[PDB]
Amino acid sequence: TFEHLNRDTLRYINLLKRLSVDLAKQVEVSDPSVTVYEMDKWVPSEKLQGIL
Amino acid sequence: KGPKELESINASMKSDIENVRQEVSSYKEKWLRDAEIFGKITSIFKEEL
């Protein structure tokens, strides 16, 4: 039983970061004073975050 | 496109209609403002014309 619980907590670790399918980003802006955009702080919509 | 961009495109056109309609009738008034004072000698000059 411990030899099964140890193997299923390594594939849980190997599923949160390593293979980890994510979203494809569309950039929306509203203020006209930004002019630079780094693609790290793109967060999804408020209605999609509540569903996910 | 994206709906948050199309909301900013469609609302920008609606404000532009509120700008061009207002600024046309500013020229429609001043061309009639020129018309009421042009006929002080020209209509009499039309009788000379």
Swiss-Prot record, chain A:
Component the THO subcomplex of the TREX complex, which operates in coupling transcription elongation to mRNA export. The THO complex is recruited to transcribed genes and moves along the gene with the elongating polymerase during transcription. THO is important for stabilizing nascent RNA in the RNA polymerase II elongation complex by preventing formation of DNA:RNA hybrids behind the elongating polymerase. The chain holds residues 106 to 157 of 261 of the full protein. Component of the THO complex, which is composed of HPR1, MFT1, THO2 and THP2. Together with SUB2, TEX1 and YRA1, THO forms the transcription/export (TREX) complex. THO associates with DNA and RNA in vitro. It comes from Saccharomyces cerevisiae (strain ATCC 204508 / S288c) (Baker's yeast). Present with 2840 molecules/cell in log phase SD medium. This is THO complex subunit THP2. It is found in: Nucleus.
From Swiss-Prot, chain B:
It is found in: Nucleus. It comes from the Eukaryota. Signal peptide: none annotated. Component of the THO complex, which is composed of HPR1, MFT1, THO2 and THP2. Together with SUB2, TEX1 and YRA1, THO forms the transcription/export (TREX) complex. THO associates with DNA and RNA in vitro. Component the THO subcomplex of the TREX complex, which operates in coupling transcription elongation to mRNA export. The THO complex is recruited to transcribed genes and moves along the gene with the elongating polymerase during transcription. THO is important for stabilizing nascent RNA in the RNA polymerase II elongation complex by preventing formation of DNA:RNA hybrids behind the elongating polymerase. Present with 5910 molecules/cell in log phase SD medium. This is THO complex subunit MFT1. The chain holds residues 197 to 245 of 392 of the full protein.
